[PDB]
């Protein structure tokens, strides 16, 4: 599939799991479903910052349906980036350790 082009709206609060991971549920605002969801994690200065995806591959099957995503963010201060372009969702997260 091609990367999603649309905008994202946050549907729920970000949550920390029992084992230091986060569950994010978002609502899609695009027209190109089905498409692959742009997902990346950075820091404050825009620097790409390592981490790993627990979810296989985040895809918008139906633009009217919210998608859940579990991820293991880097330690300390980071930004969760959902989507791409000017309207890209940027959410602050801290993981102690």
């Amino acid at each position: 599939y091609v990367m999603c082009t649309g905008s994202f709206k946050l549907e729920k609060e970000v949550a920390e799991t029992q084992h230091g991971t986060v569950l994010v549920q978002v609502k899609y605002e695009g027209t190109d479903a089905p498409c692959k969801i742009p997902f990346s994690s950075q820091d404050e200065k825009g620097v790409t910052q390592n981490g790993r995806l627990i979810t296989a591959n985040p895809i918008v099957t139906d633009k009217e349906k919210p998608v859940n995503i579990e991820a293991e963010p880097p330690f300390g201060e980071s930004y969760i980036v959902v989507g791409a372009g000017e309207k890209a969702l940027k959410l602050s997260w801290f993981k102690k350790g």
Partner: antibody
Amino acid sequence: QVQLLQPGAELVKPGASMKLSCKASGYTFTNWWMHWVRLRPGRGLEWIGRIDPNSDVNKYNEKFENRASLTVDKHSSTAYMQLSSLTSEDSAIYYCARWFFPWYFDVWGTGTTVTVSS
Amino acid sequence: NIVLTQSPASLAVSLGQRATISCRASESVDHYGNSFIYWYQQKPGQPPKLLIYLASNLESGVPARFSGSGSETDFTLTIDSVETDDAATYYCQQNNEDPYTFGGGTKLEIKR
């Protein structure tokens, strides 16, 4: 229509400093990061740094960190890059580029041919 | 710093024939399942122009004859049928870690 305008040429002395401008139009200047990249003859493209015009947060290439300064003027939607202690090795074509966050550069400036000479 | 090495330095391809250029990284440029690598095209007197993003995704406006593939440290750009206006210098770039780095550049000629 998105435009990133740069002056066509600069002539600067070795060891001196220069300040290059990039005038953005057609979009919200503070909504996108601005990067700077130079092209040297037979030496390819080199990344200098980036800045977020909204918050003035920035990041430099460590090679240039002691030598470069990224600034903006929101009022005129213009980003500036200053580089001092210039040598002949800094003769290049300098481009500003808009960051398609958080991936590639979507819009490139007109380019500024910089000559460091006396 | 992630170092990007392109191969070959230059090549000439007969008009209408297929061209292939490789870019290799000194370490992984993958970030959350996506390759943070991009392919740009630059012509003389002109600023660069994006062709490929995230290793394999075609930018809107780019002809379908252009394609990209690869992962981790090994990547390739392919033009299945070169044209006259395809003559340019091609560069790969990474942003998986600061500072951003560019490949050495591959120069494509059109073998009339």
